[PDB]
Subunit: 273 residues, 3 copies
């Protein structure tokens, strides 16, 4: 029955907001939740009410899907995501991503907060992801394949769509907002990484490290939903500075990064309208 959930999600969403045809899906991580306040003609749906969507174990911290118009683009925005560290496995974002796909989104704009493995890319920066290295155990597609959504095996050669990256690089350049491209390393968490793990990630070629992104990106590649993913850098990774990592610390720099992050998103959306 897990496999049917996106079809039920679609029927539910279509009944709540008849007529609505989203063009772009968003996943809103730390610092970017507030972007939903800018959506007009909006409808908000609790994840508790949408089949297959993640429900947090923390009382009062369940996410919401916001549907509406943003900068001339019809969007469906997940305010909140599920993570591998929640204990529901790597497939925790597969049904939501398939729901974006079936709703007709042309692509997914994934956002998250994370640490920089490069000392010269500082807290408060935004980075555009160009590839990943997965260190979470397994992948979301382990298990029987649902061929309704995609093939048993699939290439990750364009997992972070090349043309969307070129589109956004042009926007950043127009805005004079620095936007490096980096390789994302996933980590299971929910502890932050040790300093030795961070040095390992540098050795194997990582630029950014975090606890999300990979599950939803792999689920998207499987069902052929294009992805662009940008990250708010909230700290240099463990061992690279003397800052104490904590969710409070994360949220501090996520707020900072959100100022330019929002300018990039708005200009990008206006360019797609």
């Amino acid at each position: 029955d897990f496999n049917e959930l996106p079809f039920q999600a679609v029927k539910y969403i279509q009944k709540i907001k008849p007529g609505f045809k989203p063009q772009i899906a968003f996943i809103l991580g730390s610092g970017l939740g507030d972007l939903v306040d800018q959506i007009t003609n909006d409808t908000t749906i609790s994840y508790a009410d949408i089949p297959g969507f993640p429900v947090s174990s923390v009382h009062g911290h369940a996410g919401e899907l916001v549907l509406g118009d943003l900068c001339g683009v019809p969007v469906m925005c997940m305010k909140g995501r599920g993570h591998f560290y929640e204990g529901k496995g790597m497939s925790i974002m597969t049904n939501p991503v398939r729901t974006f796909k079936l709703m007709g989104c042309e692509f997914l704009f994934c956002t998250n907060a994370a640490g920089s493995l490069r000392p010269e890319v500082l807290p408060g920066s935004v980075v555009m992801l160009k590839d990943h290295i997965n260190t979470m155990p397994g992948t979301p597609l382990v298990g029987p394949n649902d061929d309704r959504f995609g093939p048993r095996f699939f290439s990750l050669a364009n997992a972070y769509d090349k043309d969307l990256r070129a589109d956004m690089a042009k926007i950043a350049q127009q805005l004079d907002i620095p936007l490096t491209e980096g390789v994302f390393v996933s980590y299971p968490g929910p502890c932050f990484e040790t300093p030795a793990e961070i040095r390992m990630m540098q050795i194997i070629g990582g630029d950014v490290v975090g606890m999300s992104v990979v599950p939803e990106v792999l689920s998207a590649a499987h069902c052929g939903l294009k992805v662009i993913a940008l990250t708010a850098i909230t700290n240099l990774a463990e061992g690279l500075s003397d800052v104490v990592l904590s969710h409070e610390q994360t949220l501090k720099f996520a707020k900072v990064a959100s100022v330019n992050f929002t300018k990039l998103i708005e200009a990008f959306l206006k360019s797609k309208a």
Copy 2:
């Protein structure tokens, strides 16, 4: 009851083909399924009918065990394997390998199709595996130990038997068929690897990358079944060429590689008869 399955498999196989005493076990991966057509005095058993053997989730694509004589050697050939990405865990090949052991095979000849991490080892090549690096989560032997089959802890120093490798290297040299030796890196799949993951695998010392081999090889080391393993290279690994990876692409070069792969297997078997 999972632990008893090989004893039931043996009783079943012995009833279907009384008298048969296999000398060598094979696991036949992509391109090498057709080798079963060369077996004489053959009996074929659907995996569905053998306790503990893997049954695919894909309608009509269940494997078969073929018992008979090949080039003067009594063999038992698994046409098809189970993989970690099927979602039954790392132990999906443990009962079949224990079945080879209890049936009396002197060793296991493992075959698979995979990508080359070395640009100079080209698609259509055959490589002999000499060691592995496991990146799948856990190992097949996680869980209580079945001491009927092997010890709680076990060395992997000769996981790809040294003397069998020397035997096969002599065969390849006699035949003038190039046969490099390589370190195999396992990957969970069922996505292919990203280009950054491939560079990571090069950095850590890999030569070949694929989605099988390790589970059955670790299960074999535990129960003391010797292993020789050869791989058909079906592509350079992701990012090392501009080919699009897909199962169709795999099968294309598996057919090519199978020509020399079969010559090596036949000469090797004649040398053991």
Copy 3:
């Protein structure tokens, strides 16, 4: 109900030994089990009788908790641990560690036997751990967070307490016992590592490799229990010598290492009394 087990463990332990107020917790791995013989005013409790404590699958090899006075310090010593390879997941040491915490221990002294990734650190040596790289799948804290014990996210910057390391380095220097500091790499097991895996671990910056430590250390960091961890080197890691790895081989050098290991522990305890 898993989450309540440490509270039940505490009530049970307090009833069996009313009044007892441990200052330091120990986990006793290979070669160091015998240290419990030196505890006075001792009480011994089978793990079978303590809620949440690990019970081995091997008949007759269940561990025991020993409570008493050692070198002027009230201690609670786990003689035996649970491991990831037992198949109960990464959380197999979480309840025992939380039990140490609730009992009031000021820190945990973790001990284990393991392989050296450095050829110049020889079998029979003792190493003090300063950091780790986890290669086991996931972490003990994957799943809903029990905020009674610690936060959803947590830093590993001081996972091997810096001041305890300085304390012990002074002891080793006073005793003229060599004590290098090393990065520990965890491995799922229960196979030992391949030679290629060992070279990978050297490449990524490891100094010592073993099948425990990480689960209990991460559980301790989550609930804020300070850790000092020392390792008995029982072999150079696979491929670095011609010794055959086996539990028998491990136990051989664990006995050797235990002589200086015990001197270090005794002097360290006297310094804390």
